[PDB]
Amino acid sequence: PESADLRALAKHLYDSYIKSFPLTKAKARAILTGTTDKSPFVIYDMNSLMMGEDKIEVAIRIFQGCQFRSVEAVQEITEYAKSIPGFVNLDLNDQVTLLKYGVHEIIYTMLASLMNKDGVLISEGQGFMTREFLKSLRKPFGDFMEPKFEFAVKFNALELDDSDLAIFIAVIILSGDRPGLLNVKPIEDIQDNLLQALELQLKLNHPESSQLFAKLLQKMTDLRQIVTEHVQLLQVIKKTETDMSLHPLLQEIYKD
Ligand SMILES: CC/C=C\C/C=C\C/C=C\C/C=C\C/C=C\C=C\[C@@H](O)CCC(=O)O
């Protein structure tokens, strides 16, 4: 049967995901819901902030923090992409294009794994910065993360685990609707059996979660929105802070 072929694919992607991302959702949840060995230091104010620097501008200093981290995620995501069957065999220009557009959608999908209603894990889970402390930041920085939490709280309500996420982030990267794609066909063919792999995976892994597959695909809309707001807000910074530098890798990704 072909089902056997789809599980092998599901398994392969899961193995690669674990190899590419150091902080999985399983670990993240273990830390958030916990355990005495995985307990994080919590940052909820400026004092605990300067206290946190030990154990582990202001709004700008953390903004650069996210920047460096996002660059790391891009690297990890790029490494995972190469493992998707057929990906590296596609035209180079498109490989670059698929990455340029899928990286941020994937970053916010996985960032949810490190979030709960109250805040978000940092420094590979050694810390936990409160949602409120982030919202208290001088504008426009103060409202950089709120849209992520709102998305996270509802995305997390689907109760997906890592083996599920591995296939879904792969489906995201292999999107034949990306601006500027040279050969949409071979890309669509790959996503086709990836979606087939996802459908079966959700059915077996969540036998009683009616239409999770359809529900999860609709979430691909919420991600689009998030990216846009982030980009607009980003344009504001570059003008209000002509003295703050932005990483090249991230600048080339935003030409959009
Ligand atoms: C030690 C890091 C301190 C705080 C981290 C808190 C949140 C960051 C968590 C994940 C990073 C993902 C997105 C960061 C949010 C906005 C990023 C602003 C830019 O700069 C870089 C983001 C980008 O454009 O990719």
Of residues 210, 225, 216, the one with CA closest to residue 156:
216
CA of 117 to the centre of ligand 1 (A): 18
- The CA distance from 42 to 9, in Å, is 39
Whose C-alpha lies nearest to ligand 1, atom 20?
A: 67
Does residue 177 contact residue 118 with C-beta atoms inside 8 Å? no
Please report, in range form, the residues annotated as the binding site for rosiglitazone: 67-70, 104, 230, 254
Would you kindly state where each structural domain of the chain is located, as residue ranges? Answer: 1-256
Ramachandran angles phi, psi of 120, nearest 5°: -145, 140
Cα dist from 91 to 69, 97, 183, whole Å: 28, 10, 8
- The CA distance from 39 to 51, in Å, is 16
What are 205's two structure tokens? 């892994």
In the DSSP assignment, the letter for residue 39 is: P
- The CA distance from 2 to 193, in Å, is 10
In the chain, what is the straight-line distance between the N-terminal and C-terminal CA atoms, in Å?
Answer: 42
State whether the beta carbon of 60 lies less than 6 angstroms from ligand 1. Answer: no
Q: What is the DSSP string of 195-255?
A: HHHHHHHHHHHSTTSTTHHHHHHHHHHHHHHHHHHHHHHHHHHHHH-TTS---HHHHHHS-
Does residue 224 contact residue 105 with C-beta atoms inside 8 Å? yes
If you search the block for the tokens 């919590």, which residue do you land on? 42
In the DSSP assignment, the letter for residue 88 is: G
* Strand 119-122 relative to strand 127-130, pairing: antiparallel
Please report, in range form, the residues annotated as the binding site: 67-70, 104, 230, 254
State whether the beta carbon of 253 lies less than 6 angstroms from ligand 1. Answer: no
To one decimal, the resolution in angstroms is 2.2
- The CA distance from 5 to 193, in Å, is 10
CA of 205 to the centre of ligand 1 (A): 31
Whose C-alpha lies nearest to ligand 1, atom 19?
A: 67
What are 206's two structure tokens? 């969540």
What are 69's two structure tokens? 């981290």
Look up the CATH superfamily of 1-256. Retinoid X Receptor (1.10.565.10)
CA of 245 to the centre of ligand 1 (A): 14
Method: X-ray
How far is C-alpha 151 from the geometric centre of its chain's CA atoms? 12
CA of 39 to the centre of ligand 1 (A): 22
Ramachandran angles phi, psi of 129, nearest 5°: -95, 125
Helix, strand and coil content of the chain, in percent to the nearest 5, comes to 70, 5, 25
How far is C-alpha 32 from the geometric centre of its chain's CA atoms? 18
- CA neighbours within 13 Å on the CB side: how many for 41? 14
Angle 249-66-64 from CA coordinates, rounded to 5°: 80
Ramachandran angles phi, psi of 117, nearest 5°: -60, -30
